[PDB]
Design an enzyme around this catalytic site. Structure first.
Site, PDB file in Angstrom:
ATOM      1  N   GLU A 439     -22.553 -46.080 -42.233  1.00 34.96           N
ATOM      2  CA  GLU A 439     -21.167 -46.351 -41.840  1.00 34.96           C
ATOM      3  C   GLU A 439     -20.475 -47.358 -42.785  1.00 34.96           C
ATOM      4  O   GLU A 439     -19.984 -48.412 -42.352  1.00 34.96           O
ATOM      5  CB  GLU A 439     -21.127 -46.797 -40.359  1.00 34.96           C
ATOM      6  CG  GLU A 439     -21.599 -45.674 -39.416  1.00 34.96           C
ATOM      7  CD  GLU A 439     -21.633 -46.089 -37.945  1.00 34.96           C
ATOM      8  OE1 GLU A 439     -22.664 -46.671 -37.491  1.00 34.96           O
ATOM      9  OE2 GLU A 439     -20.647 -45.801 -37.234  1.00 34.96           O
ATOM     10  N   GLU A 518     -27.853 -39.825 -35.832  1.00 36.70           N
ATOM     11  CA  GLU A 518     -27.784 -40.523 -34.523  1.00 36.70           C
ATOM     12  C   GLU A 518     -27.235 -39.523 -33.511  1.00 36.70           C
ATOM     13  O   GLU A 518     -26.249 -38.856 -33.776  1.00 36.70           O
ATOM     14  CB  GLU A 518     -26.830 -41.735 -34.581  1.00 36.70           C
ATOM     15  CG  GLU A 518     -27.302 -42.812 -35.548  1.00 36.70           C
ATOM     16  CD  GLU A 518     -26.391 -44.026 -35.639  1.00 36.70           C
ATOM     17  OE1 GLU A 518     -25.571 -44.239 -34.714  1.00 36.70           O
ATOM     18  OE2 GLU A 518     -26.511 -44.760 -36.646  1.00 36.70           O
TER      19      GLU A 518
END
Ligand SMILES: [Cl-]
Ligand SMILES: [Cl-]
Ligand SMILES: [Mg+2]
Ligand code: NA
Ligand code: NA
Lengths: 1020, 409, 204
Positions: A439, A518
């Site tokens: 991220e 994820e």
């Protein structure tokens, strides 16, 4: 004194040694771990806003001097974090998820900047200065964040990269005998911008500090790059060795005794690839290692070789020629007492627990672990995604302006991070992908990290989920993509746009293997949908599975002011900004207890997939599929049992066999089991479990992998309910069997004071009930808008606005029946125009007390309901239950896979899960009957009849109301119980994963409906 | 063509004609090892009852064709007319198909990435000569480069704007008419892709090499593309790795991603192993075969009425440039991490000069020959009147690596 | 500086990309201590600001003020009509209104000079010069910080005072009646701006 090092955007400075592997060498070495002299300063000496931080007369870098007196200083263990294990003496952990705990002003950091000075004396053997030693190396395996190092008063250098190893050359600074090492560690530095992982901020020297004496003519680094391809027999192994050494090192010998290799290279030019016959391959299922060594006269390196080849072919991720499905978890080192400090015994147990729940893969979120962890993964068998220490997530909100990933000033630092990640761990067979970080948006610098990795190591693909358009990554990775979007990714007839992509970029992402790095966010009670995601993997070859977020809750053990122990989360340490219980998002609780969501995961991802059916006139038929990557099913036995109302009537075992011996990986078979005639009365259930025949390092013999059931019951005999009765004038009954009434109000059941039943629509909101990231699925076709739902408040917000937590009961009327009583009530919140009518008909029918409860909502209800149920208030000594129905653990409509229909029993502590934030837990589904116990002794039985639609109720037993539970931030904040509460629920809302992920899938979402409970109540 | 596990190469034949059977057709096959015929033969096109009838299909097993131990092995089958007609000679081809039968690839071992050193830059590295880090000659001839190029001389379709563009939405929506949008040439010119400037960030020695880092950007633009060249001698061979890493902002179709070399005008032809014999692009590959090919400048490039992108040869293993008739320079190209191979074009003018000319006769007299080595080219589509490039073949911004070995031929 | 000191600071919230630069120039000029504070915000601020000012932390025994400017009671940009420019004086209790829910109160506008007293004994005098646009600052004296006040539901919930706080504001946001009625009329609403305070500080 120059303190520009604190804000420098480069990789570090000083006597830096080129990155290399972490190796098991026989070179002389010593550990500097121990109790060091320590002080904490509130600011960094020599910065403009720290003019009087040091004691009078001390210079900015005076601490480094051999003459410095630290006799009065405290000591601190190394490795540790200074904010852990010290009762708050040196401050506390700070939890943020995305937000930085300092202004976004790169490269600057706050004036309030806890700075730890560490001082250590140690002895170096005189022998280390003999000509047999070429250099002396000081190694730091982990320091948060930036640190400056002095040895015998000489400045050695500055390190960065909190979870990355750094070595410095201390050859010229050390002396024989006693030496001094001083390290100054800053909590905040320019490096903190690169380290915005979703976790506690924990400063200190938290991994090993060691010294090594590099042998003259030793081997500085080696990479034994292995490979494997299929033959008849075992197969063919290859070694492509890289030896980093001085010319004086040769001859160098590679020895692999078991494989009969002993090859001596006489110069650098002779080092060459070898092919080895009859080699068994390494995989997560079968982690076959061969002991090897590479040695010169001066040094021997021990390696364990796992022979395996990773190849991407179009959209398939292959290891050893076969597609790998990842059943993984995101994991980092975590301990409620020690923080991110590594403990080998603890790590082994952690990985053993993973294996027991069918985990075959680990993503190291979001940085390299302690290097020893990779030896355990090689030996125990996990596919590993090894991720570089990089996360700049906090730059997103401002549109990625100044994002280090695309700013040239940070480029050297980012590429150096990748180089240190790859070089340390390149020898481990378990590692099958490198990941750039997490991220951090996109940018030229991320592409440069990928280009470097590709140039250095062609053996492992490059993963990075922030590369939405697939500009520089080898796999397509997403987090929390919905079922509709994931389906769209896997299928070959869709040109729909993917997140962050135009149509060409979407097309190119669909040409690569897909993984969820994820998914199924596990926070609190949940997640739902794990079965939906697994069904996509079954259906679409491009989809290679995924990694659950995340393995463990990161609670910090602490005490209340009164000395009550608890697991603290975000905000419990007085943080200015924090993200509360988002750090409590594991499949495993802080004390290592597996949650019901982990048992659900285990069943859904079982490597041996079982199906049961009964062909007309045939015998029960078992379908078995070996979904493994390589291993056949010879280690597995299939144990069956038939139970008549829960009691075993017959049992047996069957081998998992295919067309030629043991069921091979990718092979399916069917087997007829014995005839199992139905009991004429009651229920008959067949259960089959796949279990391990023998013990492993991580599990006992008979360890279950997964199970399936088949209902073989005789056709149902519907019970005879009392005819609806017309109410009579005159006196209400007082006594109806086990129930006693005072003027129509229930006051006791079977000799004990009891109140109820009370309608309840409220449940103590799950973390998912409080989430509002994805939209809600209600207002539209869930397959639209990429499965992202419709933007909407959390379920908890709409429930509270509707007053569902504060329903009031109004009695409309009470009337006698022939041998019974009818009570009609109406429920509604203050200030609401909506209501729910409730009718109770209590009737004695052949000496049995029958209670029919009809729940009839008004028309205007337009929101999801948490539950539809009735509550009974009981004595606190009611503390256990037995039931026949789904169990043994809690279950909800989108989480039913790991349940069996049988007879189950549980105390209050076994019924309810101690989630870090108190919430809905403990619901048992599909209940035929329940019996409540008072300290193990049976008290009350309730039999439930299915409704017109065939639905059966469930129950929960709690020490507090759903309202009290919802109000408590931690278990210890709940008051002393005054009742036990039984909730009998006609319906419960599903779980979903909306705290971070999709809302409850519509099939499992509870919308307003009328419901009937049909109960018989008797003394047990 | 297919190769069943354990079987022989299997030829599927469908006669798609309206009436005529396949009796006039013969199927000729060849197997080539690195482009040279190793075995060949021919089979009749027959079905269940004599010649393959209109609308009938059949399958034929061909002879075993073991893969050559080294290099590449390719099977080609062509349907040809047995006999001359009034409009074609005997042996006239109707169409063809290929099957790669190659032994597992032996990847070349590339030099380890190297830390730059302080100190003097090398003057020569194998066949390359440098002046303060600037390439000045290759294999005895003056040469400049490599220089990043994103521009291509826009095709007529690159200039079209009638149909909408496919990029911004699902191409299956809006009856496949796309999203109203300017032409590709309009957005490329607006981004300044035709006038990228080169800025040197740094130059450093490597052990037996040189690293040059550059950054490319248009005047008045905030977007850029970093480029790094690592020239290294590895076992006497000159290796050149070029990593191209764009900045984050780029949001348009790119025409190409490649590098340009400026060569003497007497560089006048090329030979290559890869797709050919003619130019090919991502949505136009069917009429190519992987083989050995050769062409002069006039055979390489098509003289379209309006000068534009032409001449790209895709999927190149190696190329050899000819000068004044004879072999001069060889470039070997290694596939990237994703198995992708580059392509090349050879031109008498730059893509900028070509774009400026309305007719071939308006181009200036050549001062160089230009070699473009392209990691990627945008598709062709038919947007001058019809659909944009289908998204699967459309080039969007991406990082690319070229891995080259350069030697005198 | 020659007979002075310059301090440059930057203010910003955690996780914010916005900031406010502040420069203090303390200079002795003919035996007088002058302090110029220049407040220069960054570009992206896009909201109403509650106030623009500086806070000084003082001993708790500073418990009254005299001033020449608008008074005798608190006043704000859209609530000035009941003020007179004159010499005024008040204890802490007279300066601040005990609203049922603790909130902003006690701002005195258009101040030429203020004197702080300790138990009636004058201690410190601050003279304020109008800025380039002719604007004069105001002040408040409080027993708690604005953060502590904001956090308390009732007066009795505030902690025992550990300081007295002087706020010297270049600006305050207007009052309006938005709890039930129109927002602050735009003429009286505070939006981000750069401001200067020009002070002379002396013993009273
Ligand atoms: Cl009530
Ligand atoms: Cl230029
Ligand atoms: Mg959970
Ligand atoms: Na964080
Ligand atoms: Na989290």
């Amino acid at each position: 004194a120059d303190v520009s090092y604190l804000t420098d955007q480069g990789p570090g400075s000083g006597r830096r040694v080129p990155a290399r592997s972490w190796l098991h060498s026989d070179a002389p070495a010593l550990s500097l771990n121990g109790d060091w002299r320590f002080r904490l300063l509130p600011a960094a000496p020599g910065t403009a806003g720290a003019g009087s931080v040091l004691p009078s007369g001390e210079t900015v870098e005076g601490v480094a001097a051999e003459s410095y007196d630290d006799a009065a200083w405290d000591t601190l263990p190394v490795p540790s974090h200074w904010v852990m294990g010290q009762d708050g003496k040196y401050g506390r952990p700070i939890y943020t998820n995305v937000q930085y705990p300092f202004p976004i002003d790169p490269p600057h950091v706050p004036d309030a900047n806890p700075t730890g000075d560490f001082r250590r004396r140690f002895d170096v053997p005189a022998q280390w200065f003999e000509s047999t030693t070429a250099a002396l190396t000081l190694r730091f395996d982990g320091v948060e964040s930036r640190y400056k190092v002095w040895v015998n008063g000489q400045e050695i250098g500055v390190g960065s990269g909190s979870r990355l190893a750094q070595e410095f050359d201390v050859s010229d600074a050390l002396r024989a005998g006693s030496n001094l090492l001083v390290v100054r560690v800053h909590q905040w530095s320019a490096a903190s911008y690169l380290e915005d992982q979703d976790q506690w901020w924990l400063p200190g020297i938290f991994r090993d500090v060691t010294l090594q004496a590099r042998p003259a003519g030793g081997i500085t680094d080696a990479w034994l790059r292995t490979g494997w391809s299929a033959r008849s027999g075992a197969g063919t192994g290859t070694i492509d060795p890289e030896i980093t050494a001085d010319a004086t090192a040769f001859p160098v010998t590679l020895s692999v005794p078991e494989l009969g290799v002993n090859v001596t290279w006489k110069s650098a030019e002779e080092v060459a690839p070898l092919a080895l016959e009859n080699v068994e391959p390494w995989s997560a299922e079968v982690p076959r290692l061969y002991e090897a060594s590479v040695s010169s006269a001066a040094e021997s390196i021990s390696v364990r070789l796992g022979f395996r080849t990773v190849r991407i072919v179009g959209d398939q991720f292959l290891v050893n020629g076969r597609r790998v499905v990842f059943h993984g978890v995101n994991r980092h080192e975590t301990h409620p007492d020690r923080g991110r400090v590594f403990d080998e015994a603890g790590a082994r147990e952690d990985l053993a627990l993973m294996k027991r729940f069918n985990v075959n893969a680990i993503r190291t979120s979001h940085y390299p672990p302690h290097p020893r962890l990779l030896d355990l993964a090689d030996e125990m068998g996990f596919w590993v995604i090894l991720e570089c220490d990089l996360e700049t997530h906090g730059f997103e909100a401002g549109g990625w302006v100044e994002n280090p990933s695309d700013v040239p000033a940070w480029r050297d630092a980012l590429v150096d991070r990748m180089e240190r990640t790859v070089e340390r761990d390149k020898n481990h067979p378990s590692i099958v992908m490198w990941s750039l970080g997490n991220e951090s948006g996109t940018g030229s610098n991320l592409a440069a990290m990928a280009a470097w990795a590709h140039a250095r190591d062609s053996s492992r693909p490059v993963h990075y989920e922030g590369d939405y358009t697939g500009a520089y990554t080898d796999v397509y990775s997403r987090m929390y993509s919905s079922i509709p979007e994931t389906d769209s990714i896997g299928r070959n007839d869709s040109h729909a746009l993917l997140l962050g992509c135009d149509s060409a970029e979407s097309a190119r992402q669909r040409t690569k293997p897909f993984i969820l790095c994820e998914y199924v966010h596990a926070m609190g009670n949940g997640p739902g949908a794990m079965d939906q995601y697994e069904a996509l993997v079954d259906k679409y070859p491009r989809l290679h599975g995924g990694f659950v977020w995340e393995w463990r809750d990161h609670g910090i053990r602490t005490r209340t002011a009164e000395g009550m122990e608890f697991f603290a989360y975000g905000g419990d340490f007085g943080e200015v900004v924090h993200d509360s219980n988002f750090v409590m998002d594991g499949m495993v609780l802080s004390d290592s207890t597996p949650t019901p969501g982990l048992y659900e995961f285990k069943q859904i991802v079982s490597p041996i997939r079982l199906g049961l059916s009964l062909p007309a006139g045939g015998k029960p038929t078992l379908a078995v599929a070996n979904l493994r990557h390589t291993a056949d099913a010879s280690d597995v036995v299939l144990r069956w049992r038939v139970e008549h109302d829960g009691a075993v009537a017959a049992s047996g075992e069957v081998a998992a066999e295919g067309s030629d011996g043991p069921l091979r990986a990718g092979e399916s078979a069917t087997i007829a089991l014995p005839a199992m005639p139905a009991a004429p009365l009651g229920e008959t259930w067949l259960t089959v479990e796949a279990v391990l025949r023998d013990a492993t390092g991580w599990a006992p013999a008979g360890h279950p992998l997964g199970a399936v059931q088949l209902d073989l019951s005789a056709p149902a005999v519907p019970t005879r309910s009392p005819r609806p009765a017309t109410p009579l004038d005159g006196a209400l009954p007082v006594s109806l069997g086990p129930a006693t009434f005072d003027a129509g109000t229930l006051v006791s059941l079977a000799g004990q004071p009891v109140s109820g039943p009370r309608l309840e629509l409220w449940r103590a909101p799950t973390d998912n009930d409080r989430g509002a990231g994805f939209g809600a699925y209600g207002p539209g076709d869930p397959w639209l808008n990429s499965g992202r739902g419709v933007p909407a408040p959390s379920s908890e917000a709409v429930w509270k606005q509707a007053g569902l937590d504060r329903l009031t009961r109004r009695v409309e009327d009470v009337a006698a029946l022939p041998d019974g009583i009818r009570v009609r009530t109406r429920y509604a919140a203050a200030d609401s125009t909506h209501s729910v009518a409730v009718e109770e008909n209590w009737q004695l029918d052949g000496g049995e007390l029958c209670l029919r409860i009809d729940i009839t909502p008004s028309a205007g209800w337009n929101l999801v309901w948490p539950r539809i149920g009735v509550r009974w208030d009981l004595p606190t000594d009611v503390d256990g239950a037995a039931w026949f129905g789904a169990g043994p653990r809690e279950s909800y409509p989108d989480s039913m896979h790991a349940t069996m229909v049988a007879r189950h029993a549980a105390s209050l502590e076994e019924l309810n899960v101690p989630y870090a934030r108190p919430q809905e837990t403990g619901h048992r589904s599909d209940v035929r009957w329940l019996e409540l116990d008072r300290a193990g002794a049976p008290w009350l039985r309730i039999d439930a009849e299915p409704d017109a639609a065939g639905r059966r109720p469930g129950f929960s037993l709690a020490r507090h109301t759903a309202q009290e539970i919802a109000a408590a931030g931690h278990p210890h904040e709940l008051p002393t119980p005054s009742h036990s509460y039984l909730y009998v629920d006609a319906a419960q809302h599903g779980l979903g994963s909306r705290a971070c992920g999709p809302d409850v899938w519509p099939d499992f979402a509870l919308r307003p409906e009328a419901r009937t409970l049909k109960l018989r109540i008797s003394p047990a």
